[PDB]
Amino acid sequence: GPMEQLKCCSGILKEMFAKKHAAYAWPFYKPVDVEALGLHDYCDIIKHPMDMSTIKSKLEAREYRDAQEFGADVRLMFSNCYKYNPPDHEVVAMARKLQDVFEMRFAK
């Protein structure tokens, strides 16, 4: 049931945090720091920031009622990256790789 689906979601996120994917997942681990150099315009562009640690905290607080809700936040995280950065940016390529990891798990 929903309990089982959410346990699967936790396992997917755990894999996304794993050393195996760390070379391309690390930009997504923590909230974007809008005080860091270069990011002063982030909140002009991104209305709903999202990151893996926030998703983890929401799973722990049981905020997601089902897998679709969890997946929406994962996709929001990637979409923010695709919206904020130029398409040839290195972080966009890293997002695409981590999104592939996610989508193949989430589908199955």
C-alpha triplet 77, 14, 25: angle, nearest 5°:
45
Instruction: List, in order of start, the domains of the chain with CATH numbers.
Output: 2-107 (1.20.920.10)
Tell me how far apart the terminal alpha carbons of the chain are, to the nearest angstrom.
Answer: 16
> Entry resolution in angstroms?
1.2
The tokens for 101 are 């990891």
Helix (H, G, I), strand (E, B) or coil at 61: coil
String of DSSP letters for 34-47: TTSTT-TTHHHH-S
